[PDB]
């Protein structure tokens, strides 16, 4: 799930660029620019911190957020970089939506273009939004926004019509996670009512045959490079990273690390990992997912123990990860092995990285922690 | 903090 | 009728999740208060040292 | 027979409408459940981050 | 694609069955006059009728009330026949509207056609259809053929199903074949809802493909 899949052998290392705590409240929404070298930072304080890699890295007096705009209000926990739309969509608790051309402040110190497109979505049907993704094809600009309350619809950034709607997955209920096909094939929605749901991208056909029966929360989505009919997802509890065959609609993949047994009914381990990043390389998918255990996760399938990851906990001997084959699939069990705490001290959720034979990665916590790893 |  | 049974189950789940949401919000408030208290204690210790 | 048939057609339309209304109510209830569960998850995540 | 001018050929087609059932049996109107009982449907396991079909350019007549030959529908109205209307291809091609009726005894003294509807000869964009265009019935009423046609036959849930099926079958589907099977399965449910829908009259109108490109050719007037 990344352009120019890299060669095998990806392992992490102990380098970083900068750290920030500017966001007064928790930050749970970031956007990474495509045409440029910048990424967006927003916080539960209803304020968004814009950070430019070129400037924020160093060689400057202060690496403060370039574009800090709080006119949205509420809690800003929804942001996205519109695909070739020269607009940035932002969402806040108060059922409102914004699509601003804040890039207007690039060269001079001038007011950032307020939301070129904005809307206060229905408080009951959609609230403001739970999901929002824009589709770019040059000729048309279509962005798809989902709300926590079961509802899925798209909004063309260059069109007034908003008929692109997906009938609420009522059985799915909660709508807080969705997956996207790389070629606009189909979408899957991460929910928490136990059941899961999938959507098509050609005809937007609703396909609800996925689930984690325990009524578990699933907010993580990436396209499983292993099978176009397979997807990559992360769910809360037991440090779960599983791949689900949505035809069966259940996850069949593991890195088992949890007090809970595999697919444990009680899930004795409530810890999990999220913010997964997908790319095909080294004979299997190569992923970097935010480990809610604060385990900076550079994850491997064939040799998870053998490879190297960005996580901490130096007290653990050489990386320990179990590789198995279970009922037609290879199963993995993840097993564990003055000063100042370098690692984040909050519930880390977001990760973003850039490199070319070398580069940097961005990390954050559940309160505003900023970790810019090199 | 405030990065002035 | 089948769909209605499923929806009633999902609605009971919604009510339970909302109760847990209120509980988790109160708990997060207490945790943030504790974190602020720890930061203030660190402030005082740092000032003394 | 015609009274029965008219009542039957009216009740079939009414049943289809009731099913659609129940579907809409269920979609709204799933939206509300989504909001409540998202609140629960965010509150737990915030307690954990704190 | 083709220009209409060159051909100017007379009208011909095939026959198809009307979806609308004879639930239009004028229960009270039956309670009034004794003739109606003589209705072919009234007295047969099914209903044959005397076909009438014509084309009018926005209401101006341009052909004759074409009627099919003697065929059996008093037990099954399955129409497997052809008909040649009296309208030339270029004849009043602009704004031409296919209006028709079927003559079946509204009574022993009332044997005539009381079913009619009007639809443009070409499509909503101008392309002619030489393929079946099932028509919206106007029971107890006959066709008019005017541009403001009062009984539309040819140009939503069923609409969405049909449009999506047309788009997909045009060759607009990705290498993920599984949807097409599920596509038809769910089109089955949509059609089930549409059929459960009642208090409506319909007809299957099968425009005969032309052996000029040998298809339901899309002709545009010129």
PDB file of N, CA and C in Angstrom, chain A residues 55-148:
ATOM      1  N   UNK A  55      10.900  23.236   7.053  1.00  0.00           N
ATOM      2  CA  UNK A  55      11.143  24.269   8.055  1.00  0.00           C
ATOM      3  C   UNK A  55      11.260  23.680   9.457  1.00  0.00           C
ATOM      4  N   UNK A  56      10.330  22.800   9.835  1.00  0.00           N
ATOM      5  CA  UNK A  56      10.266  22.317  11.209  1.00  0.00           C
ATOM      6  C   UNK A  56      11.476  21.479  11.604  1.00  0.00           C
ATOM      7  N   UNK A  57      12.220  20.943  10.635  1.00  0.00           N
ATOM      8  CA  UNK A  57      13.302  20.015  10.955  1.00  0.00           C
ATOM      9  C   UNK A  57      14.360  20.674  11.832  1.00  0.00           C
ATOM     10  N   UNK A  58      14.760  21.882  11.490  1.00  0.00           N
ATOM     11  CA  UNK A  58      15.796  22.572  12.224  1.00  0.00           C
ATOM     12  C   UNK A  58      16.397  23.680  11.368  1.00  0.00           C
ATOM     13  N   UNK A  59      17.619  24.075  11.724  1.00  0.00           N
ATOM     14  CA  UNK A  59      18.299  25.203  11.092  1.00  0.00           C
ATOM     15  C   UNK A  59      17.460  26.474  11.147  1.00  0.00           C
ATOM     16  N   UNK A  60      16.573  26.572  12.135  1.00  0.00           N
ATOM     17  CA  UNK A  60      15.678  27.710  12.274  1.00  0.00           C
ATOM     18  C   UNK A  60      15.459  27.985  13.753  1.00  0.00           C
ATOM     19  N   UNK A  61      14.997  29.203  14.048  1.00  0.00           N
ATOM     20  CA  UNK A  61      14.843  29.619  15.439  1.00  0.00           C
ATOM     21  C   UNK A  61      13.874  28.709  16.186  1.00  0.00           C
ATOM     22  N   UNK A  62      12.696  28.471  15.614  1.00  0.00           N
ATOM     23  CA  UNK A  62      11.680  27.655  16.263  1.00  0.00           C
ATOM     24  C   UNK A  62      10.922  26.848  15.220  1.00  0.00           C
ATOM     25  N   UNK A  63      10.645  25.590  15.548  1.00  0.00           N
ATOM     26  CA  UNK A  63       9.857  24.711  14.682  1.00  0.00           C
ATOM     27  C   UNK A  63       8.388  24.696  15.097  1.00  0.00           C
ATOM     28  N   UNK A  64       7.763  25.870  15.097  1.00  0.00           N
ATOM     29  CA  UNK A  64       6.364  26.003  15.471  1.00  0.00           C
ATOM     30  C   UNK A  64       5.460  25.652  14.294  1.00  0.00           C
ATOM     31  N   UNK A  65       4.215  25.301  14.609  1.00  0.00           N
ATOM     32  CA  UNK A  65       3.243  24.988  13.568  1.00  0.00           C
ATOM     33  C   UNK A  65       3.046  26.193  12.662  1.00  0.00           C
ATOM     34  N   UNK A  66       3.284  25.999  11.363  1.00  0.00           N
ATOM     35  CA  UNK A  66       3.214  27.118  10.429  1.00  0.00           C
ATOM     36  C   UNK A  66       1.802  27.684  10.375  1.00  0.00           C
ATOM     37  N   UNK A  67       0.809  26.824  10.171  1.00  0.00           N
ATOM     38  CA  UNK A  67      -0.582  27.248  10.090  1.00  0.00           C
ATOM     39  C   UNK A  67      -1.325  26.709  11.298  1.00  0.00           C
ATOM     40  N   UNK A  68      -1.581  27.580  12.270  1.00  0.00           N
ATOM     41  CA  UNK A  68      -2.376  27.248  13.442  1.00  0.00           C
ATOM     42  C   UNK A  68      -3.680  28.023  13.358  1.00  0.00           C
ATOM     43  N   UNK A  69      -4.762  27.324  13.037  1.00  0.00           N
ATOM     44  CA  UNK A  69      -6.067  27.950  12.884  1.00  0.00           C
ATOM     45  C   UNK A  69      -7.057  27.238  13.789  1.00  0.00           C
ATOM     46  N   UNK A  70      -7.733  28.008  14.639  1.00  0.00           N
ATOM     47  CA  UNK A  70      -8.724  27.462  15.552  1.00  0.00           C
ATOM     48  C   UNK A  70     -10.129  27.984  15.303  1.00  0.00           C
ATOM     49  N   UNK A  71     -10.350  28.754  14.238  1.00  0.00           N
ATOM     50  CA  UNK A  71     -11.683  29.247  13.921  1.00  0.00           C
ATOM     51  C   UNK A  71     -12.699  28.127  13.756  1.00  0.00           C
ATOM     52  N   UNK A  72     -12.248  26.891  13.533  1.00  0.00           N
ATOM     53  CA  UNK A  72     -13.170  25.765  13.426  1.00  0.00           C
ATOM     54  C   UNK A  72     -13.911  25.556  14.738  1.00  0.00           C
ATOM     55  N   UNK A  73     -13.198  25.651  15.859  1.00  0.00           N
ATOM     56  CA  UNK A  73     -13.805  25.452  17.157  1.00  0.00           C
ATOM     57  C   UNK A  73     -13.974  23.984  17.496  1.00  0.00           C
ATOM     58  N   UNK A  74     -14.651  23.747  18.615  1.00  0.00           N
ATOM     59  CA  UNK A  74     -14.856  22.384  19.050  1.00  0.00           C
ATOM     60  C   UNK A  74     -13.535  21.668  19.250  1.00  0.00           C
ATOM     61  N   UNK A  75     -13.516  20.393  18.875  1.00  0.00           N
ATOM     62  CA  UNK A  75     -12.305  19.587  18.877  1.00  0.00           C
ATOM     63  C   UNK A  75     -12.007  19.174  17.445  1.00  0.00           C
ATOM     64  N   UNK A  76     -10.839  19.561  16.948  1.00  0.00           N
ATOM     65  CA  UNK A  76     -10.420  19.211  15.597  1.00  0.00           C
ATOM     66  C   UNK A  76      -9.722  17.858  15.657  1.00  0.00           C
ATOM     67  N   UNK A  77     -10.429  16.813  15.241  1.00  0.00           N
ATOM     68  CA  UNK A  77      -9.903  15.453  15.268  1.00  0.00           C
ATOM     69  C   UNK A  77     -10.209  14.761  13.947  1.00  0.00           C
ATOM     70  N   UNK A  78     -10.324  15.554  12.885  1.00  0.00           N
ATOM     71  CA  UNK A  78     -10.563  15.014  11.553  1.00  0.00           C
ATOM     72  C   UNK A  78      -9.934  15.948  10.531  1.00  0.00           C
ATOM     73  N   UNK A  79      -8.931  15.448   9.816  1.00  0.00           N
ATOM     74  CA  UNK A  79      -8.243  16.238   8.808  1.00  0.00           C
ATOM     75  C   UNK A  79      -7.812  15.320   7.677  1.00  0.00           C
ATOM     76  N   UNK A  80      -7.611  15.917   6.504  1.00  0.00           N
ATOM     77  CA  UNK A  80      -7.212  15.152   5.335  1.00  0.00           C
ATOM     78  C   UNK A  80      -6.615  16.098   4.303  1.00  0.00           C
ATOM     79  N   UNK A  81      -5.664  15.584   3.528  1.00  0.00           N
ATOM     80  CA  UNK A  81      -5.088  16.313   2.405  1.00  0.00           C
ATOM     81  C   UNK A  81      -5.823  15.870   1.145  1.00  0.00           C
ATOM     82  N   UNK A  82      -6.630  16.766   0.586  1.00  0.00           N
ATOM     83  CA  UNK A  82      -7.449  16.426  -0.570  1.00  0.00           C
ATOM     84  C   UNK A  82      -6.556  16.054  -1.747  1.00  0.00           C
ATOM     85  N   UNK A  83      -6.894  14.959  -2.427  1.00  0.00           N
ATOM     86  CA  UNK A  83      -6.070  14.481  -3.530  1.00  0.00           C
ATOM     87  C   UNK A  83      -6.092  15.479  -4.680  1.00  0.00           C
ATOM     88  N   UNK A  84      -4.992  16.205  -4.861  1.00  0.00           N
ATOM     89  CA  UNK A  84      -4.872  17.161  -5.945  1.00  0.00           C
ATOM     90  C   UNK A  84      -5.988  18.186  -5.978  1.00  0.00           C
ATOM     91  N   UNK A  85      -6.558  18.501  -4.817  1.00  0.00           N
ATOM     92  CA  UNK A  85      -7.664  19.444  -4.720  1.00  0.00           C
ATOM     93  C   UNK A  85      -7.248  20.800  -4.169  1.00  0.00           C
ATOM     94  N   UNK A  86      -5.978  20.974  -3.806  1.00  0.00           N
ATOM     95  CA  UNK A  86      -5.477  22.245  -3.280  1.00  0.00           C
ATOM     96  C   UNK A  86      -6.327  22.740  -2.110  1.00  0.00           C
ATOM     97  N   UNK A  87      -6.973  21.807  -1.415  1.00  0.00           N
ATOM     98  CA  UNK A  87      -7.816  22.133  -0.277  1.00  0.00           C
ATOM     99  C   UNK A  87      -7.551  21.134   0.838  1.00  0.00           C
ATOM    100  N   UNK A  88      -7.776  21.578   2.071  1.00  0.00           N
ATOM    101  CA  UNK A  88      -7.600  20.738   3.250  1.00  0.00           C
ATOM    102  C   UNK A  88      -8.909  20.713   4.022  1.00  0.00           C
ATOM    103  N   UNK A  89      -9.446  19.519   4.233  1.00  0.00           N
ATOM    104  CA  UNK A  89     -10.696  19.344   4.950  1.00  0.00           C
ATOM    105  C   UNK A  89     -10.427  19.137   6.434  1.00  0.00           C
ATOM    106  N   UNK A  90     -11.212  19.825   7.260  1.00  0.00           N
ATOM    107  CA  UNK A  90     -11.076  19.746   8.709  1.00  0.00           C
ATOM    108  C   UNK A  90     -12.454  19.543   9.319  1.00  0.00           C
ATOM    109  N   UNK A  91     -12.487  18.822  10.437  1.00  0.00           N
ATOM    110  CA  UNK A  91     -13.734  18.530  11.124  1.00  0.00           C
ATOM    111  C   UNK A  91     -13.554  18.742  12.619  1.00  0.00           C
ATOM    112  N   UNK A  92     -14.623  19.211  13.261  1.00  0.00           N
ATOM    113  CA  UNK A  92     -14.619  19.476  14.690  1.00  0.00           C
ATOM    114  C   UNK A  92     -15.897  18.922  15.302  1.00  0.00           C
ATOM    115  N   UNK A  93     -15.884  18.791  16.627  1.00  0.00           N
ATOM    116  CA  UNK A  93     -16.990  18.205  17.371  1.00  0.00           C
ATOM    117  C   UNK A  93     -18.337  18.798  16.972  1.00  0.00           C
ATOM    118  N   UNK A  94     -18.362  20.087  16.635  1.00  0.00           N
ATOM    119  CA  UNK A  94     -19.624  20.777  16.404  1.00  0.00           C
ATOM    120  C   UNK A  94     -20.171  20.534  15.003  1.00  0.00           C
ATOM    121  N   UNK A  95     -20.272  19.269  14.605  1.00  0.00           N
ATOM    122  CA  UNK A  95     -20.976  18.887  13.393  1.00  0.00           C
ATOM    123  C   UNK A  95     -20.685  19.717  12.158  1.00  0.00           C
ATOM    124  N   UNK A  96     -19.532  20.381  12.120  1.00  0.00           N
ATOM    125  CA  UNK A  96     -19.183  21.290  11.038  1.00  0.00           C
ATOM    126  C   UNK A  96     -17.999  20.750  10.248  1.00  0.00           C
ATOM    127  N   UNK A  97     -17.925  21.144   8.977  1.00  0.00           N
ATOM    128  CA  UNK A  97     -16.880  20.690   8.069  1.00  0.00           C
ATOM    129  C   UNK A  97     -16.266  21.900   7.384  1.00  0.00           C
ATOM    130  N   UNK A  98     -14.961  21.833   7.131  1.00  0.00           N
ATOM    131  CA  UNK A  98     -14.242  22.900   6.458  1.00  0.00           C
ATOM    132  C   UNK A  98     -13.287  22.309   5.429  1.00  0.00           C
ATOM    133  N   UNK A  99     -13.148  23.022   4.313  1.00  0.00           N
ATOM    134  CA  UNK A  99     -12.191  22.677   3.267  1.00  0.00           C
ATOM    135  C   UNK A  99     -11.497  23.966   2.861  1.00  0.00           C
ATOM    136  N   UNK A 100     -10.353  24.246   3.479  1.00  0.00           N
ATOM    137  CA  UNK A 100      -9.695  25.537   3.367  1.00  0.00           C
ATOM    138  C   UNK A 100      -8.452  25.432   2.502  1.00  0.00           C
ATOM    139  N   UNK A 101      -8.181  26.495   1.748  1.00  0.00           N
ATOM    140  CA  UNK A 101      -6.947  26.608   1.000  1.00  0.00           C
ATOM    141  C   UNK A 101      -5.873  27.309   1.803  1.00  0.00           C
ATOM    142  N   UNK A 102      -5.574  26.776   2.990  1.00  0.00           N
ATOM    143  CA  UNK A 102      -4.597  27.395   3.876  1.00  0.00           C
ATOM    144  C   UNK A 102      -3.241  27.551   3.205  1.00  0.00           C
ATOM    145  N   UNK A 103      -3.026  26.881   2.069  1.00  0.00           N
ATOM    146  CA  UNK A 103      -1.787  27.061   1.321  1.00  0.00           C
ATOM    147  C   UNK A 103      -1.583  28.504   0.887  1.00  0.00           C
ATOM    148  N   UNK A 104      -2.607  29.351   1.018  1.00  0.00           N
ATOM    149  CA  UNK A 104      -2.482  30.744   0.606  1.00  0.00           C
ATOM    150  C   UNK A 104      -1.391  31.480   1.372  1.00  0.00           C
ATOM    151  N   UNK A 105      -0.982  30.968   2.530  1.00  0.00           N
ATOM    152  CA  UNK A 105       0.053  31.590   3.340  1.00  0.00           C
ATOM    153  C   UNK A 105       1.448  31.052   3.047  1.00  0.00           C
ATOM    154  N   UNK A 106       1.635  30.350   1.928  1.00  0.00           N
ATOM    155  CA  UNK A 106       2.910  29.702   1.640  1.00  0.00           C
ATOM    156  C   UNK A 106       4.072  30.689   1.620  1.00  0.00           C
ATOM    157  N   UNK A 107       4.059  31.626   0.677  1.00  0.00           N
ATOM    158  CA  UNK A 107       5.190  32.534   0.516  1.00  0.00           C
ATOM    159  C   UNK A 107       5.172  33.647   1.559  1.00  0.00           C
ATOM    160  N   UNK A 108       4.102  34.433   1.630  1.00  0.00           N
ATOM    161  CA  UNK A 108       4.062  35.556   2.569  1.00  0.00           C
ATOM    162  C   UNK A 108       3.297  35.226   3.844  1.00  0.00           C
ATOM    163  N   UNK A 109       3.524  36.060   4.857  1.00  0.00           N
ATOM    164  CA  UNK A 109       2.780  35.968   6.110  1.00  0.00           C
ATOM    165  C   UNK A 109       1.418  36.618   5.906  1.00  0.00           C
ATOM    166  N   UNK A 110       0.471  35.851   5.384  1.00  0.00           N
ATOM    167  CA  UNK A 110      -0.857  36.339   5.062  1.00  0.00           C
ATOM    168  C   UNK A 110      -1.886  35.342   5.588  1.00  0.00           C
ATOM    169  N   UNK A 111      -3.116  35.792   5.805  1.00  0.00           N
ATOM    170  CA  UNK A 111      -4.130  34.878   6.348  1.00  0.00           C
ATOM    171  C   UNK A 111      -4.318  33.663   5.453  1.00  0.00           C
ATOM    172  N   UNK A 112      -4.374  32.494   6.084  1.00  0.00           N
ATOM    173  CA  UNK A 112      -4.639  31.270   5.345  1.00  0.00           C
ATOM    174  C   UNK A 112      -6.069  31.276   4.825  1.00  0.00           C
ATOM    175  N   UNK A 113      -6.245  30.759   3.610  1.00  0.00           N
ATOM    176  CA  UNK A 113      -7.559  30.729   2.975  1.00  0.00           C
ATOM    177  C   UNK A 113      -8.458  29.858   3.848  1.00  0.00           C
ATOM    178  N   UNK A 114      -9.486  30.465   4.439  1.00  0.00           N
ATOM    179  CA  UNK A 114     -10.440  29.729   5.260  1.00  0.00           C
ATOM    180  C   UNK A 114     -11.099  28.657   4.406  1.00  0.00           C
ATOM    181  N   UNK A 115     -11.889  27.764   4.996  1.00  0.00           N
ATOM    182  CA  UNK A 115     -12.438  26.651   4.209  1.00  0.00           C
ATOM    183  C   UNK A 115     -13.113  27.114   2.931  1.00  0.00           C
ATOM    184  N   UNK A 116     -12.524  26.756   1.787  1.00  0.00           N
ATOM    185  CA  UNK A 116     -13.182  27.024   0.515  1.00  0.00           C
ATOM    186  C   UNK A 116     -14.493  26.260   0.422  1.00  0.00           C
ATOM    187  N   UNK A 117     -14.530  25.063   0.999  1.00  0.00           N
ATOM    188  CA  UNK A 117     -15.753  24.292   1.128  1.00  0.00           C
ATOM    189  C   UNK A 117     -15.958  23.963   2.597  1.00  0.00           C
ATOM    190  N   UNK A 118     -17.176  24.196   3.073  1.00  0.00           N
ATOM    191  CA  UNK A 118     -17.501  23.947   4.466  1.00  0.00           C
ATOM    192  C   UNK A 118     -18.967  23.562   4.566  1.00  0.00           C
ATOM    193  N   UNK A 119     -19.288  22.829   5.626  1.00  0.00           N
ATOM    194  CA  UNK A 119     -20.656  22.404   5.876  1.00  0.00           C
ATOM    195  C   UNK A 119     -20.763  21.917   7.312  1.00  0.00           C
ATOM    196  N   UNK A 120     -21.900  22.193   7.933  1.00  0.00           N
ATOM    197  CA  UNK A 120     -22.227  21.666   9.250  1.00  0.00           C
ATOM    198  C   UNK A 120     -23.182  20.504   9.018  1.00  0.00           C
ATOM    199  N   UNK A 121     -22.662  19.285   9.093  1.00  0.00           N
ATOM    200  CA  UNK A 121     -23.440  18.103   8.766  1.00  0.00           C
ATOM    201  C   UNK A 121     -24.494  17.844   9.836  1.00  0.00           C
ATOM    202  N   UNK A 122     -25.483  17.032   9.476  1.00  0.00           N
ATOM    203  CA  UNK A 122     -26.580  16.743  10.389  1.00  0.00           C
ATOM    204  C   UNK A 122     -26.039  16.205  11.706  1.00  0.00           C
ATOM    205  N   UNK A 123     -26.532  16.763  12.813  1.00  0.00           N
ATOM    206  CA  UNK A 123     -26.055  16.339  14.124  1.00  0.00           C
ATOM    207  C   UNK A 123     -26.417  14.890  14.416  1.00  0.00           C
ATOM    208  N   UNK A 124     -27.549  14.414  13.896  1.00  0.00           N
ATOM    209  CA  UNK A 124     -28.019  13.059  14.157  1.00  0.00           C
ATOM    210  C   UNK A 124     -27.566  12.052  13.109  1.00  0.00           C
ATOM    211  N   UNK A 125     -27.697  12.386  11.824  1.00  0.00           N
ATOM    212  CA  UNK A 125     -27.316  11.443  10.777  1.00  0.00           C
ATOM    213  C   UNK A 125     -25.802  11.344  10.633  1.00  0.00           C
ATOM    214  N   UNK A 126     -25.109  12.477  10.640  1.00  0.00           N
ATOM    215  CA  UNK A 126     -23.684  12.505  10.332  1.00  0.00           C
ATOM    216  C   UNK A 126     -22.846  13.262  11.349  1.00  0.00           C
ATOM    217  N   UNK A 127     -23.468  13.992  12.270  1.00  0.00           N
ATOM    218  CA  UNK A 127     -22.686  14.858  13.133  1.00  0.00           C
ATOM    219  C   UNK A 127     -21.889  15.809  12.267  1.00  0.00           C
ATOM    220  N   UNK A 128     -20.593  15.934  12.546  1.00  0.00           N
ATOM    221  CA  UNK A 128     -19.719  16.554  11.560  1.00  0.00           C
ATOM    222  C   UNK A 128     -19.220  15.507  10.569  1.00  0.00           C
ATOM    223  N   UNK A 129     -18.384  14.584  11.042  1.00  0.00           N
ATOM    224  CA  UNK A 129     -17.873  13.488  10.224  1.00  0.00           C
ATOM    225  C   UNK A 129     -17.121  12.508  11.115  1.00  0.00           C
ATOM    226  N   UNK A 130     -17.015  11.252  10.687  1.00  0.00           N
ATOM    227  CA  UNK A 130     -16.098  10.318  11.330  1.00  0.00           C
ATOM    228  C   UNK A 130     -15.014   9.930  10.337  1.00  0.00           C
ATOM    229  N   UNK A 131     -15.354   9.933   9.053  1.00  0.00           N
ATOM    230  CA  UNK A 131     -14.409   9.629   7.990  1.00  0.00           C
ATOM    231  C   UNK A 131     -14.574  10.650   6.878  1.00  0.00           C
ATOM    232  N   UNK A 132     -13.480  10.939   6.177  1.00  0.00           N
ATOM    233  CA  UNK A 132     -13.521  11.867   5.049  1.00  0.00           C
ATOM    234  C   UNK A 132     -12.300  11.596   4.183  1.00  0.00           C
ATOM    235  N   UNK A 133     -12.533  11.136   2.958  1.00  0.00           N
ATOM    236  CA  UNK A 133     -11.471  10.881   1.994  1.00  0.00           C
ATOM    237  C   UNK A 133     -11.884  11.452   0.650  1.00  0.00           C
ATOM    238  N   UNK A 134     -10.939  12.075  -0.044  1.00  0.00           N
ATOM    239  CA  UNK A 134     -11.198  12.684  -1.340  1.00  0.00           C
ATOM    240  C   UNK A 134     -10.588  11.835  -2.445  1.00  0.00           C
ATOM    241  N   UNK A 135     -11.298  11.743  -3.565  1.00  0.00           N
ATOM    242  CA  UNK A 135     -10.849  10.995  -4.728  1.00  0.00           C
ATOM    243  C   UNK A 135     -10.479  11.966  -5.840  1.00  0.00           C
ATOM    244  N   UNK A 136      -9.311  11.753  -6.439  1.00  0.00           N
ATOM    245  CA  UNK A 136      -8.782  12.634  -7.467  1.00  0.00           C
ATOM    246  C   UNK A 136      -8.622  11.878  -8.778  1.00  0.00           C
ATOM    247  N   UNK A 137      -9.155  12.457  -9.856  1.00  0.00           N
ATOM    248  CA  UNK A 137      -9.017  11.898 -11.194  1.00  0.00           C
ATOM    249  C   UNK A 137      -8.732  12.970 -12.239  1.00  0.00           C
ATOM    250  N   UNK A 138      -8.370  14.178 -11.818  1.00  0.00           N
ATOM    251  CA  UNK A 138      -8.110  15.264 -12.742  1.00  0.00           C
ATOM    252  C   UNK A 138      -9.374  15.933 -13.241  1.00  0.00           C
ATOM    253  N   UNK A 139     -10.278  15.144 -13.827  1.00  0.00           N
ATOM    254  CA  UNK A 139     -11.507  15.712 -14.369  1.00  0.00           C
ATOM    255  C   UNK A 139     -12.501  16.070 -13.274  1.00  0.00           C
ATOM    256  N   UNK A 140     -12.580  15.265 -12.216  1.00  0.00           N
ATOM    257  CA  UNK A 140     -13.552  15.465 -11.151  1.00  0.00           C
ATOM    258  C   UNK A 140     -12.865  15.390  -9.796  1.00  0.00           C
ATOM    259  N   UNK A 141     -13.461  16.049  -8.803  1.00  0.00           N
ATOM    260  CA  UNK A 141     -12.942  16.076  -7.437  1.00  0.00           C
ATOM    261  C   UNK A 141     -14.041  15.585  -6.500  1.00  0.00           C
ATOM    262  N   UNK A 142     -13.947  14.327  -6.080  1.00  0.00           N
ATOM    263  CA  UNK A 142     -14.942  13.706  -5.216  1.00  0.00           C
ATOM    264  C   UNK A 142     -14.280  13.311  -3.907  1.00  0.00           C
ATOM    265  N   UNK A 143     -14.833  13.798  -2.803  1.00  0.00           N
ATOM    266  CA  UNK A 143     -14.378  13.444  -1.468  1.00  0.00           C
ATOM    267  C   UNK A 143     -15.484  12.691  -0.744  1.00  0.00           C
ATOM    268  N   UNK A 144     -15.110  11.627  -0.042  1.00  0.00           N
ATOM    269  CA  UNK A 144     -16.067  10.778   0.653  1.00  0.00           C
ATOM    270  C   UNK A 144     -15.891  10.956   2.151  1.00  0.00           C
ATOM    271  N   UNK A 145     -16.977  11.299   2.833  1.00  0.00           N
ATOM    272  CA  UNK A 145     -16.946  11.563   4.261  1.00  0.00           C
ATOM    273  C   UNK A 145     -17.910  10.634   4.979  1.00  0.00           C
ATOM    274  N   UNK A 146     -17.441  10.043   6.072  1.00  0.00           N
ATOM    275  CA  UNK A 146     -18.252   9.165   6.897  1.00  0.00           C
ATOM    276  C   UNK A 146     -18.416   9.761   8.287  1.00  0.00           C
ATOM    277  N   UNK A 147     -19.543   9.445   8.911  1.00  0.00           N
ATOM    278  CA  UNK A 147     -19.869   9.907  10.249  1.00  0.00           C
ATOM    279  C   UNK A 147     -19.886   8.727  11.208  1.00  0.00           C
ATOM    280  N   UNK A 148     -19.590   9.010  12.477  1.00  0.00           N
ATOM    281  CA  UNK A 148     -19.542   7.961  13.487  1.00  0.00           C
ATOM    282  C   UNK A 148     -20.875   7.235  13.452  1.00  0.00           C
TER     283      UNK A 148
END
